[model samples]
Structure formats: structure tokens, C-alpha cells
Target: GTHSHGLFKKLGIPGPTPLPFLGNILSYHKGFAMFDMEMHKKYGKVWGFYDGQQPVLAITDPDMIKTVLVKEAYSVFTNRRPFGPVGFMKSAISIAEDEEWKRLRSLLSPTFTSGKLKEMVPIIAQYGDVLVRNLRREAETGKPVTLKDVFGAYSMDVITSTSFGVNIDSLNNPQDPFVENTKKLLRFDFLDPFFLSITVFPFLIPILEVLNITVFPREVTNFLRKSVKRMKESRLEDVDFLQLMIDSQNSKALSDLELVAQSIIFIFAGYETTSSVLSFIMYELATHPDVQQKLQEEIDAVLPNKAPPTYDTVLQMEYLDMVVNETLRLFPIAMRLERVAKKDVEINGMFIPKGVVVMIPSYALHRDPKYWTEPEKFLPERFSKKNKDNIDPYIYTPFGSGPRNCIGMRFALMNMKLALIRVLQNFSFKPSKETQIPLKLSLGGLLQPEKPVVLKVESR
Candidate 1:
């Protein structure tokens, strides 16, 4: 009954049985993360699964993962999953194919230069101040603070201010059209009929594309498109990210459509992922007061007199970096890293066909007993300077690896560090009665907590 059995049989991988044309789609009712863990638990490191009729070879073996993501990346695995007709989303640099990807990456790389980020620090830190002030008000009420709400607003403010050069204080005004639309855009639902139809009947994608339909909600996409166009028209050149793109407008690197598409992806990528990570980090800190105290002490040492953190000072905080690293290790927001093979290839004795989706279960790899000691524990010392050398870059990748890894990695880390420094300098977090002791994780647009990450805040 399985349409894809021949490929898996040829590849010699094992997995759950598929039902007709659906493959393993029905088996993922529990969500992909749990499905991955369960499949790996039953089938071992390498297994076969399907999305509709398409075959996916999931690999957790670090050796094979290194080959696919690093050594053989350029030659064999250059792109992510097979691009469907997702309208303008296909034009995003993250989804663009080989030569096009390189051109876009090279063109956009300068936007995040150290010089550019340093110039943007005050803008980011200003939002950090707003985040702390807002949280302080909630803390005074003797109520638990939902990190996602505050962090989401903070991330939106930073992204809007630094990237778009449009000032929005969503921390104070949560109902801004920009913030609301972005929220709807990121609320991905796999079971939504539209998503299901595309996954099951991908052949319809061409028709959808021809009809100018996007996988993203049309209203949301149009709102962002119109908003970005407004920003583009009013763009006076300055030090912001939009200015860099505006400077390059004369070049052939990106078309006007691709430019607006790129800006939309930037807001989507920047806002939600950073906020989710911040929430997880605070959850870890609230439960682990010892680690929080040590982190606060480190922040105090770096920012004497409780002054705001500068880019240089945040960079100097090694302990802060370790804490962040540990949280990421525990909860990588981007749970799955994937690449589609360009050509049928063999790596470490496994056969991969061209167009097969190669998935690296990041959460599983990060928690694998073979690579990490006490992997479930919140121990930042593992990332300390003395122990850092032993870490394999491939295993601990929060922002993937290789040429196509997250382009915004440095910028995201800088924003997180600044926010943490500003907050920790004046406050300490403790688990409130409402805190989820063993935090329950669920797949949303990213790896997210099933319950709100609620914590009590105290002024030091």
C-alpha cells in the first residue's frame, strides 16, 4: 500500500508503516518532535519517514550529520527541503537555491557587520530598558510574569527599531498592527486545512502559485507587504539595516519583489525565535536560582554600578555566554535542521537519493547521551572556557552550521545578551507557584513551552 517503500527498502532504513498515499503523516498527530523521539527510540539513529508521498531520511549520527551539513554540504546538500510554491516565501535567502542563495547571502552579509551592530546597540538596549521597566511593573503586582508576552514585545521593538528604522514600542502597545499581523503570521498550525492540503496534495502548489496564493495568510502577508512598502518609500538612508538594502537598490542583487520578501522574512525570523529563546532562558534561570545568582554576579562584575550593558561589555561576559549556551543546548528553538540532497550520494555507507530530505533532529542530538554528560541537567560549566574546546561545533549548533547557517546569529546573540544584562543587573528571577517545574515542550512555529513560562521577579 505504501508508494515509497521501494526507496526505503533500497536505502535499507527502517520506520513505521505508512498508510497508502499519506505515508507517515497520520502518525505525527502528536507533533514532529515527539514523533522524531519516538521513531528514534524504536528505529535507532537513522530512520525513514514520509511527508505525503515524499521520502525523508532522518539522521542523528553525528558522523553522517557532519558530512551532510558540513563536509559535503556544498557539493551534495546545498538546499533545505524541496521548495514548494510558497509564493514570495520561496524568495527568502533561507529558501533560495545554490547560486541565488550565495548572491543574496553575500549582499546581505554586510548588514550585520560588527560596525553596524555596534551602531545599533543603543537602540536594542533601549528596548531592553523598556522590557525591564514593564516587567518591574508586573513584578510589583505580586503576579507571575509571562516571559513570552514581554520578550515578544521587546524583540518586536528591537527588530522594528534596528532593522526597519521604524520606531514601535510594542512593549507598551501590544495591539499595533505590525505586531498583531506578525503574530498571526508565525502561528503555524500543521493541522490547519490549508497546510494539510498542501502537505498532502503538493501537486496543487503550482496551481496555488499561478493563482498568486501564498501558504501564509493572504491578509497578513498583504499587511506586511504594504507596511514594508511604506517603509521603503519613506526610507531616508541612515545606519539601519534597511539603509544598507536601500544603498544596494541600484545593484542587481535583489529585485523589488525579492526585497520586500526579504524584509518580511527578516521580521518573522527576528521577532519570534529571539523571544522564544528568551522565554526558555528565563524559565531555566527561575528554576535554577543558583545559576541565576552566579549569572547576576557576572552581570554585576561586567556592568559595575548597575549601568546599562554596552556591546563590548556584553561580549566580555563569559559566564553570561555560558548560561545562554546551556539554555540553548537544553532547548534549541529550531528543533529540526534539514537539507535536501542535490544528487544521490553516499555518506558513511548510507545511500541518499537526490531530493530526499535529510533531517537532523537537533533536540535529540543535543540530548544524546553519547555526546553530552548529564545532558538533561542545567549545567553551564560544560560551556565554560576550560571545557569549551571539547564541544563539537556540529553537535551544539543552535544556529545551524555551514555556509547557509543562520545569517542573523551574531545579531540575535547580541540582542539577547544586552536584554539579559539590563534585566539581571537590577532583578533576580525565582520560580513562582505557577512556574512549570518540568517545563512541557510543544511544537508551535518553533519549539515552545506548552504552558506559559511564568516566573516571579525580585529587585536586587
Candidate 2:
């Protein structure tokens, strides 16, 4: 912090002071929800904070957010903050830079094409079937169930099936090697000295790399690499994402390792995000039974014949869509989105130099009373067709807006919608004695429940 002691002061930005080397990242150790809310309350819309020596300007102002994330995005803020040195991850589209990124993104887009997603619906709903079946067991016992573990398993099943075309039922078989490795991979030791050291001092990255140290578990990486390679080699003819990727190959071809990297990235990207959103949606519906009843009514009205949900069938669900939109508004899994200034620039008279990180606190913006009514209430009405048009695009970006928004947005939405439709059509969620009334968010790695979201399930 000494090196950049007066950095924000020079820019006339206000924020809390930073420690010498640790910077403000420790504030997030508790979780992003509370820390971001506290910071937003204290600093208003715009403030400056530090990540090691790197300065991050956190902004929730709609106008500033627009310029940073949309209008001037391509011209200036084109890349996210560096992810430091992760060997094969450098090839991952999430970490790839510039032209390579554009190419990879373009190639990957075809995988989520409408036709392909339609073809994968049956595949996705199959897992949703598995989920409902698994939940029926709990429903019969009349016992409260923790949704995090259940959704995690379902999400893994869906992602692995759609992305890699490998059928592993983690929902029923929790001890599968794939599930075990993925759990290990997602577990981060944020409190570990070695982890904190590299985070607070990025310069230590090279030294750590030289020492052959890596952030993720070696066994997990090795297992996934081998597993993905085996799937790719098998070359089964299918309509899944892997096949689409294989078909999209051309002059701008990705190497075998790069292709594997992308597949791993897809799994990593969708696994937690979709699961978290599904779990939160359940939590909200369990607490807000009225919304649940209305949503169920819509689901039944849309498919009165008790047919399995098709892409077109789910598309007819306006209330379900509204419920999803409202849930995302309240508990956007992505608490914040970051973009780096590719070059020095100014937005609304505020100057941001190159290399500074621009932070968009999605959670704060979603709940800002200025833009919302009864912001804390679980009101799906806010996203009804009549009120949705009033919502500003940049102000409510659960899936970070612009060219770099979540690539898997459509797929994720369909997966989530299908799961919700399937489960809600068969069963209802109720707040169990163990349920936390107002959910407490823990931000170990992602914004999720502080405790297991225990809810009683009953057949409708």
C-alpha cells in the first residue's frame, strides 16, 4: 500500500485505507455480500480500493457502469484483471487475451446455438428427472434437504452431459471420481499463507511457478485432463457441446490441449454458477410460497397435458421467467464483475488510468433503493413484462453485460428453468425448522448460503 498510498487520493476518490501489503482483499474474506454492502453504504456509489498494489475502482453508479461495461468497453476496457500464471488456463477462453479471445469466443458460440440447445434439452431434462426422483426420496421421508449438495450434483451431471457428453450421475453416485475431483478443485484455501501470499504479492507468482507450485490440486487437474482427453479420443457422434466444438474446427483451430482447456473451463464456469442460482431460487420460493404457487400455476397452465418440458414449452413460461429474473435480481450469484482498463480513459469527468481494475458491484446495484421498490422483498412483479422495460440494462446485469457477458447464459437459463419446472411441477418446497429465515451468504469462494439451505419437500 505504501507504493500506492495516495493513489486514490490523487484521483480524488474516497475509500477505506489499506494495509501495507494485504490491501482490501481481506475485507472480502468474510464474503462479498456483506463487505460490498458495507462499502457501498460507506462510500456511496464510487470508491477506490486496493488489491495488493493494484488499484481497483468500485463503481455502482449506473452511468459510470455503462461507460465501463458497455459503451466504451471495446474501445478501452476489453480485458479482465490478469489471473496471474496458471499453466493450461492461459489457453482457457476466460483467461485468453485480445484476438485469441475473440476467435475462441466465436468458435465457442456455435456450441450454444439455439438448435444445439434444443437438441440438448432432453439431455438436460434427463438429469432434472434424476433430481426429481432423488428429491422424491426426501419428500417421502418428509425430511428437510440441503439444496447445495443436491444442486451441485445435478449441475455436475448436466454440465458433464451437455459439455462433455459423458454420463455420470453424481446425484445418485456422489463418490464418483469426477465428483470427488471437482469438489477438491473448487475448494480454495484462502486462509492459507501460501494462498494469501501470492494474492497480496503477485510478484510471488513467478517464484511459486518456478518452485512448481500451482493453485489447483494437481490430482484434480490430472484426472480431468485424462478424463477429457479420453472423451475427446472416443469421438462419439453426439449433439453435445464437445461435438459442436469438434465440428467448428477450422483454420483458427485450437490445439488438443487448448480444446481440453476450453472443455474444463466450460465445466468450471457452469458448475458452481448454475447450482448456486438454482439453490437460491429454491430458498426464495420456499420462503415465499405465494410466488411458488403462482409459478406452479404458470408451469401447469403452460403444460396442462403433463408432457416433458421442451425448449419451446419452457419458453412459454412468463411467470417462471419473471421468477428467475426476480431471484437473480435479489441474489445474483456473481456478486461483482471486473474489467481492466486497457488504456487510460475518462468517463463522466473521472479519469481511470490503464491497468486499474474497474469493479461493478452487481449485488449493490440490484438492491439500490433508488432503482428498486421494497428492495429487500421477494417480489417477482418487478420483472413482469410491464415493469421489466423500466429496468436499465447495466443496472441489473446478473450475467455481466456487453460482448463478454456469460457465454453460457442461455444454456444456464434453460438448465435452471428446466430443473425448476420439473421439480416444482412434481413437488413443493417448504421452510423447514432448520431453514435460515433470511438467508446468510458466505463468500468462501462464491456467494452461497452461510449454512445449508434446509427445506422440506412435499409432493404437490
Candidate 3:
């Protein structure tokens, strides 16, 4: 049996027997579909399993998750393990711990603050305009646009401007190396489960790496390194993320590696998460025209007569906020939040020993029947001020909770709202024949549609 531990033994953590070498690997692979869905059905909250020489506890309990996130009983969990080409140079905040993490986070925090984000609003909004103009040109010529590619370009432009103070203009210069390489970097398909399994199980990483395995492309790493170097030398006075990092570099408090790591991490974070959010919103707009129409009416009322949407305009659209919140509810960017116990702690009368991984499955918790009525349905009204007040605060956390929660939430939300407003103001979208109904998420990657999302765009 794999369940050999003090609390695990006492609590009777039920799991299928593990084989010698494979451990629970066979059951994990064979029962993928069932494993994904069954725990929620049977456990209703928590379940423990052995997955390939590791003890995995899948939890959907909101209260239990709150304890992990807020109690700080767990030291910050760095679920990430060294693997791939970039693995060796992993200085990003995502992989750091203790004093190192604190130093980086303190320096990076100012860049994402509301005041600083307000300064960067023009850059974000300008890119939104670029996207609108491109989409409008396509509509005039009656050419179908791939929504994902268009939004990908839009997000890249926004991230580039804020990250390095450079105007990528991905809309006009789609062939630019920076833009193309960014897409390639984000589209790296190896970050999913199979590769993640190798990373988590340290013994497997060497064999995989020796076989020339990697999650990020070599060109992508080269691009990032070159981009950072350029930003470092330029001496730009602009109040972008890169400039902030450079400003912080003058302080004796931080190292060069720490500064570079913070910059690259912010760039990566701004690029992928915001892009996926906008993409999902577009998909929803195409599928649910009524919801789109309602949102359009709100946008129309705010900025009448084809006016470019501004930061102020976006802020006033409460319905727009609701739509974004509902979309996050369905497909949160970070599906699970992980932390490691720093010391022995009692949770719900259970003694969780130090060093055990504490995982809070945001995906499962968001979809739980106990917290949300009609959990599968996409209803924007659920997040309205009144309705939101009624719901348990812990149950609806897309950005997570407590001190370690996403620092860039306000910036991310602003970017998302501006992009959505700009696009919806000029174009009405409907699902193309190629669009898959009841979008199925690809297993192993970020919350992404299994198939390409092609939409028919028309001038409103």
C-alpha cells in the first residue's frame, strides 16, 4: 500500500495499491477521465490518492482551502521543479522561496499597484484601439478572422508595451520576431501533465531532458534574454514594468539576477493569463449572442457614436465586470493553488504534517454545488454587488485569497475590460461552423478550448 504515514494511516486514506516500479502510474493513466471526474462525485469534498510514488490529495472544500491559503501554516509552496532548458535559469518569482521570494516580491509589487497601472492604462488602451482597427479592416473586406490569433496579437502588444515600453504593434507587424516568438513561447504544449509529471518526479527529469525534451523553445529563451538586455541598456524614462525593475536595481537591496527574474516573470505572467481571459470572453460572446448584445448595449450607452473606449468608460460598465467574473468562475486561469506545510498544523481536526503539499483546486471548488447554484451555467448576475455579497467570499476566488494572491489582478482586469469593450463596440461575433459546441478544455494545459475557436465577425 502507498498510504504509509502517521495521519494517512490513521485517517484511512483510501487509494488503489501501488506497483513496485510504476507505483500508481498505470491507474493514473488508465483512469484519467474517471480520475478527473470521480473524486467530486464520491468524496464531495476531499479525497487522497497515490499517483506514481507521490501522495496526491484532491480538495474542493472551500473552508479547508481557506485554511491553507490564509493560515500560513504552509510555507509558500513552490510546486515547480527544475526541468527543460529554462529550468536551469529559473529565477522567476514562481520558483523562489523564503527570503529570496520576499525580496523579489517586495521590489516587483510597486509595478502592479493601481497608481502605476493607471499610468500604464494608455498603453493598454492604445493596443485595444489597434486591435479594433485591425478587426474593422478585416470586416470591411469581409474576411473571417481567427479570434484566438487576433486576441493573442492584442495581448502580446499590451504585454510588450507594459513589459519593455516597446510598441510591438502585433496587429500591423504580425511577422515581427518578437511577436511571433512570444506566440511560440506561450503555445509551448509541453507544460502540461506528461511533462509536469516528469518535473514533479525528480527521477524522471534527467531522462526526459537527455532526450532533448523542453517546455520552452530555445528561440523563446533567446528572445527573452535579448529583450531584457535591450531594456537594460536603453535607459528609458518611461514608467513601464521594465523601467520599474531597473529603478529598483539601483537599490543595494536586490541582486541583478533577482531583478532580471522579476522582469521576466512579470512579462510571462502579463502575456499568458490576460490573453487566455480575453480569448475565453470572445468565445463566450460568440456563443451567447444575447449576453453579448446586453453587454453591447451597456458599452453603447457609455461611449456612444463609435468613440474609442477609455479607462473611465470601462470602469463604469458593471455588467462588463460581471461577465468577466462569470467567465473566470467557469475557467479560472490558475486551476489549482499549491502550498507546502511549513510546520505541523491542525486543519478540521486533522493533523497535517510539515512538508506535505497543500493543494487548493480552484477549478473544482468554483464548480462545487454547495457554493454555487446551477454551477455549470454561466450567469453574470451571480456576481452583481447584491448577489456577490450573499455568496461565501472564499468560494468564488479566481485570483486566490490572502497575502500571496495575485498582485496584478487590478491591472489584468483593466486590460481585459478595455480589450473586450474595444472589440465588442465595433464587431458582433457569432460562432463559425468550425466552432465546437459546449467547448471542451484540453486536458493538461491552461484552461484552453480543445479546438480552434473560429468566429464570424461583422460590423455592428
* Number of the top lDDT candidate: 2
Error of 1 at 425 (Å): 1.1
User: Could you give candidate 1's per-residue lDDT for residues 1-460 as a string of tens digits?
Assistant: 4656567877678988766778788876766677877887889889988888888898887788889888987898889875556787787887798888878888888887888899999989888888888988888887878888888888888987887777777867668787777766464566556666677888888997899877667788888778777877776442677777777766656677787777778877887889889998988888888998889888888778687799889889999999999999988877789999999898998778887899988887888778899889999999999999999887888899888888899999999999998888878888888888899876443478998788888887
TM-score of every candidate relative to the true structure: 0.94, 0.95, 0.89
Candidate 2 residue pairs in clash (backbone atoms < 3 Å): none
lDDT of 2 at 12: 86
Candidate 1 regions off by >4 Å? 83-85, 191-193, 236-238, 443-445
Steric clashes per prediction = 0, 0, 0
Query: Please, what are the lDDT tens digits per residue for candidate 2 over residues 75-103?
Result: 88878887754776677898888787878
Whose TM-score is higher: candidate 2's or candidate 3's?
2
lDDT of 3 by residue, 379-427 (tens): 8999898898877656777887776778788888999898988888888
- Model 1, residue 365: distance off in Å is 0.5
Query: Which residue pairs in candidate 1 have backbone atoms (N, alpha carbon, C) closer than 3 angstroms, thus clashing?
Result: none
- Native-vs-model 1 lDDT? 0.82
Q: What lDDT score belongs to each candidate, Candidate 1 first? A: 0.82, 0.83, 0.71
- The deviation in Å at residue 4 for candidate 3 is 5.8
Measured by TM-score, how close is model 3 to the native structure? 0.89
Error of 3 at 331 (Å): 0.9
